[PDB]
């Protein structure tokens, strides 16, 4: 279960870099500089890693400081093959966002959060970045009357369009995600869903530019099931990139290596992913845990990439099993792929079998058959097989 760079998977610089700061606790280890971090990742087999602004250039930087914190990065990239597939922006930790950003109540750091946005993007293109994920997660509120919802809603659709407008006119080949998540550091955040994001993005000027970018973890923090929600974004055409990572439950955000947390929602997701044929990067936002030092990083990460190997191989041999091809069947799965009524709707008006003639008892003793389906999928998972 090696991984190579043709498996695309990537690691944001805050995740191997994160010191381990919490809520009740100081950082745990040094800083990593980007460049070892670069280093260390292509080593383990990782295609690539992505950046906020801030991770690759401090807050405050010179123009000339800037230069050569890039021209670093660069030279690092070039000396190992990694590509930068996806940039984003820290509109979070500095204190003038503590409101949000694009839905700050202040009009002059919304004005400032666009433009250190749009500073940010053209040195993703310089990167080669294919996609720019967005994460509001200072866009929200503690009590009711702090934010009013609608007004906040026209002032994320004003500043998206911007950024929509201005990629355009530069004429740039980079898409936008957005990333849900429900809550923390805000007591509730705006778009808080998968669902509610991909809703948000029908009422964009241009929709075509703009995708998700689903979290395992976040969807979790909400109870849902997050292949469910992945199918949902790629039914709509708007699966643009992936956050990988663990999660236990209904809590504060684990960010728990991938494979972690919820074991069998991870085969699910890999049996979808691979099966509908996502072709963008397997990206990791996930945090090795505090209690570890740096040998403990590289092997939190090393797992990473090795759980999401293992699944793909058992996913592909659930699929590839002629037993759990005719379990499918038992199950009507192949029912469910074809159309209600092709045949259309006055067809089905005068079909007495679908009414006056059903006989509802007898279809109602049907079982599913779903648990023995469960079973071997459960066996496959375990390599019980
Ligand atoms: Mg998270
Ligand atoms: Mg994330
Ligand atoms: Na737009």
Same mark, same amino acid.
């Given at each position: 279960?090696?991984?190579?760079?043709?498996?695309? =998977?990537?690691?944001?610089?805050?995740?191997?870099?994160?010191?381990?700061?919490?809520?009740?606790?100081? +950082?745990?280890?040094?800083?990593?500089?980007?460049?070892?971090?670069?280093?260390?990742?292509?080593?383990?087999?990782?295609? #690539?890693?992505?950046?906020?602004?801030? /991770?690759?250039?401090?807050?405050?930087?010179?123009?000339?400081?800037?230069?050569? %914190?890039?021209?670093? =990065?660069?030279?690092?990239? /070039?000396? @190992?093959?990694?590509?930068?597939?996806?940039?984003? @922006?820290?509109?979070?930790? %500095?204190?003038?966002?503590?409101?949000?950003?694009?839905?700050?109540?202040?009009?002059?750091?919304?004005?400032?959060?666009?433009?250190?946005?749009?500073?940010?993007?053209?040195?993703?293109?310089?990167?080669?970045?294919?996609?720019?994920? +967005?994460?509001?997660?200072?866009?929200?509120?503690?009590?009711?009357?702090?934010?009013?919802?609608?007004?906040?809603?026209?002032?994320?659709?004003?500043?998206? &369009?911007?950024?929509?407008?201005?990629?355009?006119?530069? #004429? $740039?080949?980079?898409?936008?995600?957005?990333?849900?998540?429900?809550?923390?550091?805000?007591?509730?955040?705006?778009? !808080?869903?998968?669902?509610?994001?991909?809703?948000?993005?029908?009422?964009?000027?241009?929709?075509?530019? $703009?995708?998700?970018? !689903?979290?395992?973890?976040?969807?979790?923090?909400?109870?849902?099931?997050?292949? %469910?929600?992945?199918?949902?974004?790629?039914?709509?055409?708007?699966? =643009?990139?992936?956050?990988?990572?663990?999660?236990?439950?209904?809590?504060?955000?684990?960010?728990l290596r991938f494979g972690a947390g919820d074991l069998r929602?991870?085969?699910?997701?890999?049996?979808?992913?691979?099966?509908?044929?996502?072709?963008?990067?397997?990206? =990791?936002?996930?945090?090795?845990?505090?209690?570890?030092?740096?040998?403990?990083?590289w092997a939190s990460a090393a797992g990473c990439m090795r759980?999401?190997?293992?699944?793909?191989?058992?996913?592909?041999?659930?699929?590839?099993?002629?037993?759990?091809?005719?379990?499918?069947?038992?199950?009507?799965?192949?029912?469910?792929?074809?159309?209600?009524?092709?045949?259309?709707?006055?067809?089905?008006?005068? &079909?007495?079998?679908?009414?006056?003639?059903? /006989?509802?008892?007898?279809?109602?003793?049907?079982?599913?058959?779903?648990?023995?389906?469960?079973?071997?999928?459960?066996?496959?998972?375990?390599?019980?097989?």
């Amino acid at each position: 279960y090696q991984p190579t760079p043709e498996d695309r =998977f990537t690691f944001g610089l805050w995740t191997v870099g994160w010191q381990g700061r919490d809520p009740f606790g100081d +950082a745990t280890r040094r800083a990593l500089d980007p460049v070892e971090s670069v280093r260390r990742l292509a080593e383990l087999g990782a295609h #690539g890693v992505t950046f906020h602004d801030d /991770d690759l250039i401090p807050f405050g930087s010179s123009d000339s400081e800037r230069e050569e %914190h890039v021209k670093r =990065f660069r030279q690092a990239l /070039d000396d @190992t093959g990694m590509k930068v597939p996806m940039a984003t @922006t820290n509109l979070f930790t %500095h204190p003038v966002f503590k409101d949000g950003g694009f839905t700050a109540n202040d009009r002059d750091v919304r004005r400032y959060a666009l433009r250190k946005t749009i500073r940010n993007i053209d040195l993703a293109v310089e990167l080669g970045a294919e996609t720019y994920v +967005a994460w509001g997660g200072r866009e929200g509120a503690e009590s009711g009357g702090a934010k009013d919802v609608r007004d906040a809603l026209d002032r994320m659709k004003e500043a998206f &369009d911007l950024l929509g407008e201005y990629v355009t006119s530069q #004429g $740039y080949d980079i898409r936008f995600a957005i990333e849900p998540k429900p809550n923390e550091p805000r007591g509730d955040i705006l778009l !808080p869903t998968v669902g509610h994001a991909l809703a948000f993005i029908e009422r964009l000027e241009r929709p075509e530019l $703009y995708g998700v970018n !689903p979290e395992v973890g976040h969807e979790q923090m909400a109870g849902l099931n997050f292949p %469910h929600g992945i199918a949902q974004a790629l039914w709509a055409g708007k699966l =643009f990139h992936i956050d990988l990572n663990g999660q236990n439950g209904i809590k504060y955000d684990q960010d728990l290596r991938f494979g972690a947390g919820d074991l069998r929602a991870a085969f699910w997701l890999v049996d979808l992913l691979e099966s509908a044929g996502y072709s963008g990067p397997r990206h =990791f936002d996930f945090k090795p845990p505090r209690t570890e030092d740096f040998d403990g990083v590289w092997a939190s990460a090393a797992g990473c990439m090795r759980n999401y190997l293992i699944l793909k191989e058992r996913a592909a041999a659930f699929r590839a099993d002629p037993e759990v091809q005719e379990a499918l069947r038992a199950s009507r799965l192949d029912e469910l792929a074809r159309p209600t009524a092709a045949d259309g709707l006055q067809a089905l008006l005068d &079909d007495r079998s679908a009414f006056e003639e059903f /006989d509802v008892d007898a279809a109602a003793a049907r079982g599913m058959a779903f648990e023995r389906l469960d079973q071997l999928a459960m066996d496959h998972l375990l390599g019980a097989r």
